[PDB]
Symmetry: none
Subunit: 56 residues, 5 copies
């Protein structure tokens, strides 16, 4: 048959990305995919942080 088993364990005592005026597009901790078929992942378009100025 089909048998899929997932065990994810996450602890944290320190700090993560402490600061001002920062961009973070894609972040992942303990990320996993196990489909029984194909895996299609798509990211298309605009992802932006604009603090004033002129952008085109």
């Amino acid at each position: 048959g089909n048998n899929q088993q997932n065990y994810q364990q996450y602890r944290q005592n320190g700090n993560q990305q402490q600061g001002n005026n920062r961009y973070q597009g894609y972040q992942a901790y303990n990320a996993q995919a196990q489909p029984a078929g194909g895996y299609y992942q798509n990211y298309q378009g605009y992802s932006g942080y604009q603090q004033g100025g002129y952008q085109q």
Copy 2:
């Protein structure tokens, strides 16, 4: 038959992303997918933070 089992455990004692004027597009802790078929993930379009200025 079909047998799918998921165990996710999350603890946290520190701090995460402490600050001002920040962008975070996609963030995931302890993320998992195990479909019995295919997996289709799509992100299409606009994702933006604009603090004044001119954008086109």
Copy 3:
């Protein structure tokens, strides 16, 4: 037959994303999917935070 079992445990003693003037598009803690078929996930369109200025 079909057998699907889910165990999710979440504790937190620290702070998360403390600050002003911030954007967060997609955030997930302890997220999991195990359908007995396919998995179709779609995010299409506009997702934006605009603090003044001009956007087109």
Copy 4:
């Protein structure tokens, strides 16, 4: 049959990316994919942090 098993364990006592005025495009800790078919990963478009100035 099909047999897919995932074990991810994450601990942290130090600090990560502490500072001001920073860009982070793609970050991943403990990231894994094992589909039973193909794996298609795509990132197409714009990903930018603009602090003033002129960009075209």
Copy 5:
């Protein structure tokens, strides 16, 4: 049949990339892919951090 098994273990006691005015395009700790078919990875477009000035 199909047999895919993943074990990822991550500990950290030191610091990582502590400082101001920094760019990080693509970063990965403990990253692995083992699809049962092909693997297609694509990164196409713009990825930039602009602190003032003129860019075209």
